[PDB]
RNA sequence: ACGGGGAAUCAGGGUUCGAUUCCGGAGAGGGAGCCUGAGAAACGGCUACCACAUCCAAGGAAGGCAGCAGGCGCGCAAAUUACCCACUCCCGACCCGGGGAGGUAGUGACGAAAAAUAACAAUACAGGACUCUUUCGAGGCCCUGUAAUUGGAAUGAGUCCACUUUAAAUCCUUUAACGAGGAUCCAUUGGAGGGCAAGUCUGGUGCCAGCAGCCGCGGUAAUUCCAGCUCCAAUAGCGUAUAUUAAAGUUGCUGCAGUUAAAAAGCUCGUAGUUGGAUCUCUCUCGGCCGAAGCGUUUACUUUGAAAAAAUUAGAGUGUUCAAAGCAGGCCGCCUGGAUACCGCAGCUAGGAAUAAUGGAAUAGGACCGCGGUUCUAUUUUGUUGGUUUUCGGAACUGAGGCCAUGAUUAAGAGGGACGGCCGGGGGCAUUCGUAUUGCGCCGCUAGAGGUGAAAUUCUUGGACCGGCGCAAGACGGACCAGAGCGAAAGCAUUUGCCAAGAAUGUUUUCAUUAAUCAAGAACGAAAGUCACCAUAAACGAUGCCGACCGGCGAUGCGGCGGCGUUAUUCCCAUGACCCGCCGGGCAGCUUCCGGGAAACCAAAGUCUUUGGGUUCCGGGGGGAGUAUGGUUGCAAAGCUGAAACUUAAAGGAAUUGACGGAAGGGCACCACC
RNA sequence: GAAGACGGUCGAACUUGACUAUCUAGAGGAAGUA
């Protein structure tokens, strides 16, 4: 980005994108919209 | 000849630091363009997703097909062809695999026979290739 | 070698070792100073007085007879020029080139020689300005060149 | 133009001692040169010399006994502290058993071994062995 | 890029790192504003906005882990939601309470220190060496083993009481009992062609699979792949990747290079910068013969002193069982430590005075002296008081006189400038000549003239070409013309005149350091190109500039100095042309074990590991590429400046042996010719 | 002596422009890459 402020700005945009992706992966389960978290239990 | 007088310290050091940029090792490691072109970004290793297995053809004074892997890195999305060292080690590699990629030895230059390949595979599915090759571990199912 | 010329040459005077006046010379200090005084009133430069006193009077060195130089005698008496004689001859040569050059504008090898003469004037004027012979705003200029001689 | 007139004289009696000659004429003389040559003569390296009086500057005719290997100047005259003397004689001198470094100290021009004995530093002029 | 103390590496010089436990700063999601208080613009305080985000009954309410744990994410990359205030300290009203500061355990092959995986004896060896034997062969003579040969001896790793340790524990240390023979109580990681220690042993493979940092190995005998066996190196460690240091005298201050390998600017001028020739041998008032009062022109330099946190580093002492460590310990209540050095630069202090800068008297407004005059003033002075008055003493300014050896260093085989006679294809302007070419006028002649290896192309009886006569036009100056001359370089040649320069020489002239090299800045600049610009070349000695030193030899050009003798001016000198020298700069050449250099070669490309005279530009493996982009000048062409991605193990220079021909010269054969 | 209000100041932020930068959805194509 060839400036110290714009480089920090670009890195924060990428961090916002990646954090949106990870939160969208971890939103699908056990919450207000997702299916229940199914725990199979086995004693070995 | 060079200036030698007792008050020549500014001429001497401003000439050395300007002639230092004509050295290949200084220009590489103090400019910043070569670090932005390095797909590892200065790291020793990296991690990527195997996109496809790729056979690369050896350079002219010998003849074989080197078994490389086209892998897209995780941390920046750059694509990379990387060499899988021993024989029957391409059999250990599926597609869309986690893979660990190192440098190949000459710090960004292509090691001898393989044309334009700077990287090699170290782990596949978080198991080292040496443990698979010598039969110490197996690929998880 | 030479400053502005590309040559070198070993041609100069060579004073003797003995600093005394010779025994044939009968002129004293005061009549030699009288000769210098009467010769300076014909407009003769300090370098032209010593040639006259050497050639036709037997005065080999005025410093050895009088204990003083030619220019210091003319400066202590008051008979000295305003600007020194080696800077005077450089401005006189720069005038004569510029006079010739305004007739002959295609003369490239007087235009080049004018720059060598004029840069020698500035190099000599700076020395006299450090040693406070010239007043420290005197400036040679091509417009007021011809009036100074 | 001629700067560092001692560098002329030490190159002249170096180049003449190599040619096997018995005498060198060095000009112009200077009082630094005479004190340098006196240090060399008192340790046996040159022998007697005669200063020729022109009224302008001197000339010196040095006699040569063929014991000199090398005579050098150091330009510029660096300041040499007494703690820094060992590095200079490591670089310049060929052995710890012979050779000298000439310093101008404030107690005069002397060799590096005498300067330790007078407990003095100074500036370096040159070296001979 | 938080800064230092410091760290790694290191001949010497250096290069790189320092987020990180000590010190200093900053900030508590982003900015901003505040309250309280000695202290805060505080965030385990408050108030907003911005971004996120929690509870809700939808009205409202609450938030800030870059503290300790822990989680998610991110990634190549990093530990326990443990115990305790016992130690070190801190806070409070306080001997008492509290402290995720801190201590203690856990995980911990970051890293550092110590250190097991066996020792011994007896046998046996168609071992080896040692004493005798000529040799065989003999020895308690000494060693070795690839003996699952024999033998009991010694131990920890473990298992595990107890004590000790600790806040309580663990660990270590100490001791019971058990604990070894294939002592299976099993050492690994990389290699085995070279670099580089160690197998052209064996099978498989057959340019495949693969190995290989590099050179290379592999195509049916692989010393190199895949395996077995053997061997090598380091060893509880050893490979790989990346950063970085040494190697790298491949960034060069020490200490490199620039003719031909990468490379010196077209030329001269010229600001800053850098560098610059000799020369010059301590006293005054008091306080007790010494100090207080001055320094001596001013610095640099050098030596000293004091001031410089600890830790770290160097280093003294001291048997942590040794060591890395630690700061303790040692005698029979005593005794002794807890040193010391280094800490650049800048700033303080005191000595030195060589080197290197700078100052001081040249219109004398100079010093040292007494004498004089003008203005103001210390306050001592008059038993006290009041007032006047001076003196004394001190400044600030001016006149004469005396005195000083009164006062200017020499004149660079540094540089300017004069002067003298010369010299030159140096330059400009004017002028003069020469032939040739082109065109024109006339006359004679007749069908060809041109160009090539060959025609081709083109003009002629509308008489070409030719031969003679005359005129003009633009030019251009042959031979003489030289390994000669001049010019800064491009470059410069007919006669004569004018103008303004210049080198060298000669000088017992003059100034007296005025100098060298030069960013920036400027003047001229082949030839091509463009409407005056353009400023570029094998612009080439493929070779910065200034200075010193270092071999010979003969010519030549200019100037000067001498010298037999020839000529010319009728004699005579005086000169010119020759001849024999000498001196000084110049253009060159020959030569050489001066010394260099990779060599070709070079008297500089020498005086270089015995490395430093001053200074400018400039190179760093080959390409990409003098390319793209940006800036700038130019009307434009172009000029200056000028990369990166990527690719590659060589490209390149000298020299030597051969190979070649449709290159030129020689010798030879009826298996060649005549 | 609280709420409140005029004014001043400090001033986060908000809106509209202009310039500039980045992340993303994006037709078309070209060349080289093999």
From Swiss-Prot, chain A:
Residues of the signal peptide: none
Basic and acidic residues: compositionally biased ranges: 1-9
Compartment(s) where it occurs, according to its Swiss-Prot or TrEMBL record: Nucleus, Nucleolus
Disulfide bonds: none
Function (record text): Required during maturation of the 40S ribosomal subunit in the nucleolus.
Record-stated family: Belongs to the TRAFAC class translation factor GTPase superfamily. Bms1-like GTPase family. TSR1 subfamily.
Name of the protein this chain belongs to: Pre-rRNA-processing protein TSR1 homolog
Taxonomic classification: Eukaryota, Metazoa, Chordata, Craniata, Vertebrata
Residues of the full protein shown: 47 to 90 of 804
From Swiss-Prot, chain B:
Sites bearing N6-succinyllysine, chain numbering: 53
InterPro entries on file: NA-bd_OB-fold (IPR012340), Ribosomal_uS12 (IPR006032), Ribosomal_uS12_euk/arc (IPR005680)
SUPFAM superfamilies: Nucleic acid-binding proteins
Pfam families reported for this sequence: Ribosom_S12_S23 (PF00164)
Region feature (Disordered): 1-25
Subcellular location(s) per record: Cytoplasm, Cytosol; Cytoplasm; Rough endoplasmic reticulum; Nucleus, Nucleolus
Positions where 3-hydroxyproline occurs in the chain: 61
Linked residues for Glycyl lysine isopeptide (Lys-Gly) (interchain with G-Cter in SUMO2): 36
One MF term in the entry's GO annotations: RNA binding
Family membership: Belongs to the universal ribosomal protein uS12 family.
Disorder cited: Brachycephaly, trichomegaly, and developmental delay: An autosomal dominant developmental disorder characterized by brachycephaly, ciliary trichomegaly, dysmorphic features of the face and hands, hearing loss, and developmental delay with short stature. Intellectual disability and autism spectrum disorder may be present in some patients.
Protein name, per record: Small ribosomal subunit protein uS12
Species annotation: Homo sapiens
From Swiss-Prot, chain C:
Modified residues (Phosphotyrosine): 37
Cellular component terms (Gene Ontology): cytoplasm; cytosol; cytosolic ribosome; cytosolic small ribosomal subunit; extracellular exosome; focal adhesion; membrane; nucleolus
Post-translational modification: Ubiquitinated at Lys-26 by RNF14 and RNF25 in response to ribosome collisions (ribosome stalling).
Residue(s) of cross-link: Glycyl lysine isopeptide (Lys-Gly) (interchain with G-Cter in ubiquitin): 26
An example molecular function term from Gene Ontology annotations: structural constituent of ribosome
Pfam families: Ribosomal_S13_N (PF08069), Ribosomal_S15 (PF00312)
PTM annotation (N6-succinyllysine): residues: 26, 33
Highest taxon, organism lineage: Eukaryota
Keywords: Acetylation, Cytoplasm, Isopeptide bond, Nucleus, Phosphoprotein, Ribonucleoprotein, Ribosomal protein, Ubl conjugation
PTM-bearing positions, type Phosphoserine: 29
Family: Belongs to the universal ribosomal protein uS15 family.
Record text on subunit structure and interactions: Component of the small ribosomal subunit. Part of the small subunit (SSU) processome, composed of more than 70 proteins and the RNA chaperone small nucleolar RNA (snoRNA) U3.
Record protein name field: Small ribosomal subunit protein uS15
Organism, as annotated: Homo sapiens (Human)
Swiss-Prot record, chain D:
Location (main, coarse): cytoplasm
UniProt xrefs under Pfam families: Ribosomal_S8
Compartment(s) where it occurs, according to its Swiss-Prot or TrEMBL record: Cytoplasm; Nucleus, Nucleolus
Example of a GO cellular component annotation carried by this entry: cytosolic ribosome
One GO BP: positive regulation of cell cycle
Lineage: superkingdom: Eukaryota
PROSITE patterns hit by this protein: RIBOSOMAL_S8 (PS00053)
Record PTM N6-succinyllysine, positions in chain: 87
GO MF entries: RNA binding; structural constituent of ribosome
UniProt keyword terms in alphabetical order: Cytoplasm, Diamond-Blackfan anemia, Nucleus, Ribonucleoprotein, Ribosomal protein
Disease implicated: Diamond-Blackfan anemia 20: A form of Diamond-Blackfan anemia, a congenital non-regenerative hypoplastic anemia that usually presents early in infancy. Diamond-Blackfan anemia is characterized by a moderate to severe macrocytic anemia, erythroblastopenia, and an increased risk of malignancy. 30 to 40% of Diamond-Blackfan anemia patients present with short stature and congenital anomalies, the most frequent being craniofacial (Pierre-Robin syndrome and cleft palate), thumb and urogenital anomalies. DBA20 inheritance is autosomal dominant.
Listed NCBIfam families: PRK04034.1
UniProt similarity note: Belongs to the universal ribosomal protein uS8 family.
Subunit structure as annotated in this protein's UniProt entry: Component of the 40S ribosomal subunit. Part of the small subunit (SSU) processome, composed of more than 70 proteins and the RNA chaperone small nucleolar RNA (snoRNA) U3.
Protein's UniProt name: Small ribosomal subunit protein uS8
Gene label: RPS15A
């Amino acid at each position: 980005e060839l400036s110290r402020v714009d480089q920090r700005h670009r890195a924060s945009q990428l961090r916002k994108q990646k954090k949106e992706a990870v939160l969208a992966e971890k939103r699908q389960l056990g919450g207000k919209d997702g299916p229940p978290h199914q725990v199979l239990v086995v004693p070995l | 000849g060079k200036c030698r007088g007792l008050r020549t310290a500014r001429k001497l050091r401003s000439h050395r630091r300007d002639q230092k940029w004509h050295d290949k090792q200084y220009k590489k490691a103090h400019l910043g363009t070569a670090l932005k072109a390095n797909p590892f970004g200065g790291a020793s290793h990296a991690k990527g997703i195997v996109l496809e297995k790729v056979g690369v053809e050896a350079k002219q004074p010998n003849s074989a097909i080197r078994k490389c892997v086209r892998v897209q890195l995780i941390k920046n999305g750059k694509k990379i062809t990387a060499f899988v060292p021993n024989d029957g080690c391409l059999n250990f590699i599926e597609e869309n695999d986690e893979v660990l990629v190192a440098g190949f030895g000459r710090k960004g230059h292509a090691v001898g026979d393989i044309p334009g390949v700077r990287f090699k595979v170290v782990k596949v599915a978080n198991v080292s290739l040496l443990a698979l090759y010598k039969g110490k571990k197996e690929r998880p199912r | 070698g030479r400053m502005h010329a590309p040559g070198k040459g070993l041609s100069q005077s060579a004073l003797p070792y003995r600093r005394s006046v010779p025994t044939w010379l009968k002129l004293t200090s005061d009549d030699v100073k009288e000769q210098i005084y009467k010769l300076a009133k014909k407009g003769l430069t300090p370098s032209q007085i010593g040639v006259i006193l050497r050639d036709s009077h037997g005065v080999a060195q005025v410093r050895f007879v009088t204990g003083n130089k030619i220019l210091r005698i003319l400066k202590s008496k008051g008979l000295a020029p305003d600007l020194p004689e080696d800077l005077y001859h450089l401005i006189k040569k720069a005038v004569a080139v510029r006079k010739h050059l305004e007739r002959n504008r295609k003369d490239k090898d007087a235009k080049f020689r004018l720059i060598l003469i004029e840069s020698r004037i500035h190099r000599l004027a700076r020395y006299y300005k450090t040693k406070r012979v010239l007043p420290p705003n005197w400036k040679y200029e091509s417009s007021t060149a011809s009036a100074l001689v | 133009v001629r700067m560092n007139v001692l560098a002329d004289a030490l190159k002249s009696i170096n180049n003449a001692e190599k040619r096997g000659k018995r005498q060198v004429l060095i000009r112009p003389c200077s009082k630094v040169i005479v004190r340098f040559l006196t240090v060399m003569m008192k340790h046996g390296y040159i022998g007697e010399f005669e200063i020729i009086d022109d009224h302008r500057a001197g000339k010196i005719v040095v006699n040569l006994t063929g014991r000199l290997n090398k005579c050098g100047v150091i330009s510029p005259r660096f300041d040499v502290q007494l703690k820094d003397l060992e590095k200079w004689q490591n670089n310049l001198l060929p052995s710890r058993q012979f050779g000298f470094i000439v310093l101008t100290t404030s107690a005069g021009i002397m060799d590096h071994e005498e300067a330790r004995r007078k407990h003095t530093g100074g500036k370096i002029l040159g070296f001979f062995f």
